[PDB]
C-alpha cells in the first residue's frame, strides 16, 4: 500500500495550466524516495515547515505536477499578481501547501521533453452587451476555464484563442491568450502538494 508516484515518471508532463493531479487518500509515502530521483532546486512551503512535510500523517495528500522553467520562479506563489498564479494555477490558501521547483537529471529516463513551456497570459470574457469585459480569475485549481480554447502547448510567442459561447449562456467570447518561454537543456518541473488534515483520522503517513 505504498503511495504511487510511479505515473509521475513517464510521458510528457503537461504544461502549467493543464497540470495533472494525483490524490492519495490511503497509503504510506516516502517523499525523499522521490526527491532523490530529481535535483530539487526550490523547496518553499506555506502553513507548514519544509521539513515538516516529510513526516506527519494527513487525511489526503494531493500532488500536482507540470513543466515550469526556473526563469520565472517568481510568478508561482501567493505573492505574484501575474498570469501564472491568476489565470493558470492557483492553490488553496486555506489548507497547508508545499511547492517544489525541481529539475530532471541526465541519468533519469522516460521523462520526455515538451518542446516549450507555455502559459495562459490572459483570460477574459467579453459580454454579450456592448463592449464590457470581465477577467476570469481561477479559483481553487479550477483548471482555468479558458482551457478548452487553448491547446496543450502554445505554438508561437503570443497567440490568440477565442470561442463564442452558445447564445444564453451567454453570448460572451471566452477570449484567451497564450505565451511561451524558451526551452531549457534539462526539463525543469514544478510540483505542488496540498495536504489537508482530518477531523480525527489520518491516512497518508511517512513510510519509515
Amino acid at each position, epitope marked *: 500500500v505504498e503511495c504511487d508516484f510511479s505515473p509521475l515518471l513517464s510521458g510528457t508532463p503537461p504544461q502549467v495550466y493543464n497540470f495533472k493531479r494525483l490524490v492519495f487518500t490511503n497509503c504510506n509515502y516516502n517523499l525523499t524516495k522521490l526527491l532523490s530521483l530529481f535535483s530539487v532546486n526550490d523547496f518553499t512551503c506555506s502553513q507548514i515547515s519544509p521539513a515538516a512535510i516529510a513526516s506527519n500523517c494527513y487525511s489526503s495528500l494531493i500532488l500536482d505536477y507540470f513543466s515550469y522553467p526556473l526563469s520565472m520562479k517568481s510568478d508561482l506563489s501567493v505573492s505574484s499578481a501575474g498570469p501564472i498564479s491568476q489565470f493558470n494555477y492557483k492553490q488553496s490558501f486555506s489548507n497547508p501547501t508545499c511547492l517544489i521547483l525541481a529539475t530532471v537529471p541526465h541519468n533519469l529516463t522516460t521523462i520526455t521533453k515538451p518542446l516549450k513551456y507555455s502559459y495562459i497570459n490572459k483570460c477574459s470574457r467579453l459580454l454579450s452587451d456592448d*463592449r464590457t469585459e470581465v477577467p476570469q480569475l481561477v479559483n481553487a485549481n479550477q483548471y482555468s476555464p479558458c482551457v478548452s480554447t487553448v491547446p496543450s502547448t502554445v505554438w508561437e510567442d503570443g497567440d*490568440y484563442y477565442r470561442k463564442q459561447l452558445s447564445p444564453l449562456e451567454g453570448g460572451g467570447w471566452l477570449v484567451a491568450s497564450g505565451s511561451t518561454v524558451a526551452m531549457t537543456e534539462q526539463l525543469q518541473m514544478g510540483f505542488g502538494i496540498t495536504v489537508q488534515y482530518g477531523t480525527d483520522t489520518n491516512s497518508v503517513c511517512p513510510k519509515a
Partner: antibody
Amino acid sequence: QVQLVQSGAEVKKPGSSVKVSCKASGGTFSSYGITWVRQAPGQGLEWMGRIIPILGISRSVQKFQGRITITADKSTSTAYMDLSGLTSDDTAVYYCAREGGSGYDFFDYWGQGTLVTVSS
Amino acid sequence: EIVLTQSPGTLSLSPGERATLSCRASQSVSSSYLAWYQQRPGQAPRLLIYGASSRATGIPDRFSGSGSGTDFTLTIGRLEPEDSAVYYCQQYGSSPWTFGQGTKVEIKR
C-alpha cells in the same frame, strides 16, 4: 459587417514618425484583431503586426521590431501604428485588416489604405 | 518563413473559360492552411477562399478552392469581365504569414 476607415497620406522625412489611424466604424472592437499589411508601390503584400484591444496584446514581424509600436484605444475603439525610425524604403501603402483568432487568422474586411511617402 | 511560387502570372482567357492558379510552397505547409485573396484594380484586397477549401461569406461559387500539403490550386469555373484582378495566395500556415507573389487575370473579350 464593420467597414474600416483609415487616415490619409502622411508625407514624412527619412527619419521621422507616422501614426496611421484605423477607425472601427460601429463603436465595436469585438474579439477581433487589427493586422497591418504593407505593400510597396507596384509590389506584393507583407505582414507587419497584430493587436487585440480586448487584451492589449501586440505582436510584430522580426524585421520591423524595434521600430514599430501598434496600439489601440479600446474605449474610443480606434487602433494605430507608429512606425518610428523609418527610412526612405518604407514608402508604401499600408492596410489595416480584421483577424479571426488562432487557426483562423485570414484577413476578412480591409481598410481603404494610407500611402506613406517618406523623402525630404 | 516560406517563400512560395504562384501561377505563370498575366493570363489571357476568353469569358466562359476555366482558369487555374497554382501556389507551390518551398517549405511544407498544413494540408488546409492557405487563403486565396483577390484585389481589384485600385482598392483593398477582398478574401476569396479561406483554408484552401471553404469560400468567403458572399463569394459566388465559381471560385473553387483545392490543393493540399505543397501545391494549392484556385480554379475559377466560369469567367466574367468583373474578374480582372490580382490574386494572392497567403500561407497563414507558418510564421510570419507569407503573401504570394500574386497572379494577374486579364479577361480576353
